[PDB]
Amino acid sequence: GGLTPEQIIAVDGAHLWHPSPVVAVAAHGAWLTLIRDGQPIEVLDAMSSWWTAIHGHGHPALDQALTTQLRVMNHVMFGGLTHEPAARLAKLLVDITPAGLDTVFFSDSGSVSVEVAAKMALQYWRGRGLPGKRRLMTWRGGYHGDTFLAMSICDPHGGMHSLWTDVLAAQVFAPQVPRDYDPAYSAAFEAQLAQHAGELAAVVVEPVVQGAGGMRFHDPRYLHDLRDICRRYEVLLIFDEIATGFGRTGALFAADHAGVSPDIMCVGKALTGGYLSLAATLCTADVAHTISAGPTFMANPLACAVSVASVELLLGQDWRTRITELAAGLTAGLDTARALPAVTDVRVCGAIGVIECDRPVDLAVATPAALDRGVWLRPFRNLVYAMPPYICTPAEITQITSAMVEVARLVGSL
Amino acid sequence: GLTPEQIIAVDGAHLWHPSPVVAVAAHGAWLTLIRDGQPIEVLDAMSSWWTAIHGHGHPALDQALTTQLRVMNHVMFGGLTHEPAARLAKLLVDITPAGLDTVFFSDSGSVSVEVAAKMALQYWRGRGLPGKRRLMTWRGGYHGDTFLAMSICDPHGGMHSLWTDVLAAQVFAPQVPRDYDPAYSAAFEAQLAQHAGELAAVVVEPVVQGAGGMRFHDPRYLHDLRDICRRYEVLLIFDEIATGFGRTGALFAADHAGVSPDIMCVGKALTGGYLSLAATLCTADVAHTISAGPTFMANPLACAVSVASVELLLGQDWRTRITELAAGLTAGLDTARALPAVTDVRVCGAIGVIECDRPVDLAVATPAALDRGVWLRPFRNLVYAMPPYICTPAEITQITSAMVEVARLV
Numbered sequence: 021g022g023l024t025p026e027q028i029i030a031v032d033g034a035h036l037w038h039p040s041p042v043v044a045v046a047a048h049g050a051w052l053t054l055i056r057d058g059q060p061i062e063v064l065d066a067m068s069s070w071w072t073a074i075h076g077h078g079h080p081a082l083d084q085a086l087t088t089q090l091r092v093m094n095h096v097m098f099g100g101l102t103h104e105p106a107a108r109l110a111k112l113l114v115d116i117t118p119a120g121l122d123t124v125f126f127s128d129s130g131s132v133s134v135e136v137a138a139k140m141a142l143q144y145w146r147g148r149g150l151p152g153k154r155r156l157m158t159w160r161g162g163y164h165g166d167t168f169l170a171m172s173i174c175d176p177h178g179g180m181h182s183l184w185t186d187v188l189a190a191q192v193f194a195p196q197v198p199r200d201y202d203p204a205y206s207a208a209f210e211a212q213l214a215q216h217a218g219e220l221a222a223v224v225v226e227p228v229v230q231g232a233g234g235m236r237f238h239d240p241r242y243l244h245d246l247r248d249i250c251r252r253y254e255v256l257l258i259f260d261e262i263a264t265g266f267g268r269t270g271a272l273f274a275a276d277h278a279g280v281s282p283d284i285m286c287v288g289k290a291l292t293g294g295y296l297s298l299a300a301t302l303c304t305a306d307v308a309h310t311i312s313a314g315p316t317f318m319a320n321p322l323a324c325a326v327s328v329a330s331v332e333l334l335l336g337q338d339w340r341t342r343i344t345e346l347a348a349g350l351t352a353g354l355d356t357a358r359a360l361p362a363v364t365d366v367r368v369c370g371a372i373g374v375i376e377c378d379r380p381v382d383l384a385v386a387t388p389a390a391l392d393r394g395v396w397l398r399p400f401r402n403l404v405y406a407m408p409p410y411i412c413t414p415a416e417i418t419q420i421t422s423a424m425v426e427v428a429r430l431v432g433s434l
Numbered sequence: 435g436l437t438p439e440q441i442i443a444v445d446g447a448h449l450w451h452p453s454p455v456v457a458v459a460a461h462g463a464w465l466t467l468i469r470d471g472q473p474i475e476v477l478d479a480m481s482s483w484w485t486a487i488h489g490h491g492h493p494a495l496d497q498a499l500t501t502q503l504r505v506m507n508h509v510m511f512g513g514l515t516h517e518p519a520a521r522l523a524k525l526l527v528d529i530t531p532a533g534l535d536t537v538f539f540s541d542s543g544s545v546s547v548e549v550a551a552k553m554a555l556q557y558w559r560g561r562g563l564p565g566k567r568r569l570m571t572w573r574g575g576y577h578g579d580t581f582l583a584m585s586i587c588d589p590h591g592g593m594h595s596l597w598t599d600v601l602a603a604q605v606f607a608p609q610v611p612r613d614y615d616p617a618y619s620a621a622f623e624a625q626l627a628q629h630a631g632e633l634a635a636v637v638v639e640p641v642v643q644g645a646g647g648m649r650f651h652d653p654r655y656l657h658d659l660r661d662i663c664r665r666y667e668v669l670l671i672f673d674e675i676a677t678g679f680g681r682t683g684a685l686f687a688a689d690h691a692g693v694s695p696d697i698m699c700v701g702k703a704l705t706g707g708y709l710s711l712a713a714t715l716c717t718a719d720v721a722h723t724i725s726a727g728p729t730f731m732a733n734p735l736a737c738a739v740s741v742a743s744v745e746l747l748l749g750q751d752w753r754t755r756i757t758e759l760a761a762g763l764t765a766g767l768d769t770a771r772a773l774p775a776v777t778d779v780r781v782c783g784a785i786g787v788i789e790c791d792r793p794v795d796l797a798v799a800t801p802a803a804l805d806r807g808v809w810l811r812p813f814r815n816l817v818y819a820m821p822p823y824i825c826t827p828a829e830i831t832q833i834t835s836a837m838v839e840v841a842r843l844v
């Protein structure tokens with residue numbers, strides 16, 4: 021109890037599993053206080069603590085919503101009891117999500133809300149006398165969580181299905197969806213789906229942006245194709261928006277770029293503004309009713325309360341202009357990366373900026389390089405990318421994009 | 435803002451549940467519910483499903499949360515570490531069964547069970563034996579509601595016929611009996627022996643099987659499982675998500691047998707019922723053999739309140755406290771032993787169960803206990819409670835009186 025940074029890393033190295041780690045001692049706004057060679061430094065949280073900290077850390081409105089709920093009621097069991105934070109969050113979600121989503125199931129993590137989505141899809145078709153509809157279809161390059169079911173629909177090469185083969189469910193995979201719209205891709209997706217339709221419960225994809233699978237973007241028109249294909253072959257459409265939710269891609273939900281509603285949808289990550297774990301699975305009235313005819317901390321009051329505040333905070337400001345300024349800033353700051361020798365692509369979509377490199381990025385070099393520039397950056401595979409808090413000033417975005425450019429330079433450099 | 439009536443309307447229209455009663459407050463061992471539009475204080479007999487061991491809104495746990503909130507809410511656990519995670523991991527490694535010295539944090543009990551299965555499977559692969567992929571358990575168990583966890587839940591309770599081909603097919607031994615019979619253990623070893631080359635691990639709830647029927651078994655069964663797993667080279671996993679942190683009379687139910695599992699899951703009471711957090715612990719052997727995460731992994735807020743809650747338990751003599759709760763439950767439930775619908779009355783530490791000979795109508799049970807100032811949640815033929823450790827003798831009496839009465843209603 022009460023530990024020194026050196027004591028913390030001594031305990032950590034002996035006893036903690038991680039997903040060499042740097043000790044973090046504070047977080048406020050877009051900034052973390054990290055310990056580097058015995059000294060505290062303030063660095064920009066360029067990753068938003070893995071997509072979560074959309075309003076920054078220790079935002080007064082979320083701090084207060086939390087301590088206000090804490091005064092009244094920490095937690096009650098959602099079996100036989102309901103409460104205001106859950107009712108309030110459900111109403112909000114139902115109002116702001118794509119049209120038709122009328123029903124809300126809370127859970128504790130994004131990976132669990134995906135299992136819940138899949139359970140809804142299976143039970144739906146069983147409710148309709150078609151329990152042969154049990155497999156899932158997706159395209160390559162995706163990520164949906166780390167639980168066994170969620171793994172079955174992650175990219176087979178990235179999620180090491182080979183090291184889990186015959187332990188995972190065999191789902192159907194379409195090729196990687198291209199960035200540019202190609203009607204031939206949609207036609208082939210349709211032709212593959214037609215071959216499995218009677219055994220398929222759902223198509224599940226991340227809309228517009230594929231996150232942990234490789235930070236790829238695809239034309240929102242592909243989602244219009246998916247909606248039509250699914251409606252035509254009687255297969256449910258599930259959108260995983262755990263990473264794309266709450267303004268991140270420039271729309272409130274990435275599905276909004278195509279104007280499509282899925283039958284089932286997952287949200288998480290930025291849901292609580294990065295305070296506490298909370299996820300949600302939504303579905304249509306038809307899905308709920310057909311099924312009709314939980315986790316221990318389901319709908320946690322504390323988590324629902326901070327999330328209520330976070331969503332209202334987003335909604336009560338001109339978030340859309342904010343994201344547009346963030347994207348302009350990322351575009352301007354990353355532009356000089358295009359001409360770097362190791363750089364293969366530079367892409368931006370809302371508050372997401374990616375530098376794709378021609379070789380895997382070395383973390384032992386990249387991490388201290390960015391910290392030297394006052395920026396916490398966490399590359400993966402061949403990608404130097406950022407998803408910064410919406411509160412970042414133009415100067416902060418410039419500081420973030422400079423450190424990314426510099427890491428990318430170093431990637432060619434030696 | 436919403437009025438209780440507005441909450442009911444929104445809830446009925448938009449919320450999926452495990453008509454619900456509106457809860458508006460929770461403090462100590464009491465909840466404030468709305469009934470007939472009036473707020474009433476009732477005892478949380480269930481501890482909000484095992485979670486609220488020190489009661490709701492405990493000053494020390496509130497302060498712990500608010501203190502961490504003023505310094506940092508959350509940071510990604512990829513590449514960073516922090517003091518809450520370290521303090522918790524050190525506490526957990528110190529207090530759990532000997533040999534468990536590595537901690538993997540997750541956000542729910544189900545996920546921690548999945549992490550345990552993954553550790554077991556990857557362990558044998560690091561041993562050159564990837565054929566060891568299956569899990570073995572006994573009937574009556576509950577391990578969570580994710581697909582992997584469902585595969586080791588009681589096949590009957592989990593409707594495994596209407597999930598056919600979607601769940602992994604695991605090995606099930608017969609229901610472990612309450613009293614100790616060596617033949618049961620000999621028969622478990624024999625079923626296990628047939629599948630040893632196929633089995634990565636045995637996974638059970640030690641001493642008490644919770645959501646699967648509130649059944650108790652002799653700790654000596656765990657001694658035999660430990661022995662059997664060791665001899666056949668199958669890992670032993672204890673799921674202590676419900677049984678942990680003093681609930682059965684020992685700090686961990688494994689302690690009743692004096693055995694250590696190779697992998698252990700904890701959750702529920704970990705944070706004292708404030709926030710969702712779970713942990714999977716494994717031995718050095720398991721960790722080194724494997725090495726040769728969730729978004730909110732090791733959340734500072736949940737880790738900080740857990741440290742407070744765990745220190746709060748250790749810093750009192752929790753062991754005498756649980757003994758008193760058990761005596762009080764036994765005193766208060768005994769009279770039901772001689773009711774016409776009552777099959778069994780059993781107590782294990784701060785857990786009290788009246789089993790009946792028929793399903794319990796909740797439409798009658800729930801309004802009956804509310805009238806007695808108690809929140810009770812019967813399940814199947816079971817009327818049961820696991821009250822906060824802070825309940826006074828008068829509160830236990832009120833709880834057990836309301837339990838005897840719902841049973842009396844047969």
Ligand SMILES: *Cc1c(COP(=O)(O)O)cnc(C)c1O
Pocket residue numbers: 314315316317542543544545547576577578579639644645673674675676677701702
């Ligand atoms: C509560 C329970 C679980 C599941 O935990 P969740 O947080 O609800 O996902 C797993 N195992 C046991 C023994 C449990 O009692």
Ligand SMILES: *Cc1c(COP(=O)(O)O)cnc(C)c1O
Pocket residue numbers: 128129130131132134163164165166226231232260261262263264288289727728729730
């Ligand atoms: C992060 C992520 C998940 C998994 O969420 P966890 O809370 O880490 O379990 C699932 N789907 C997508 C798209 C994600 O980005």
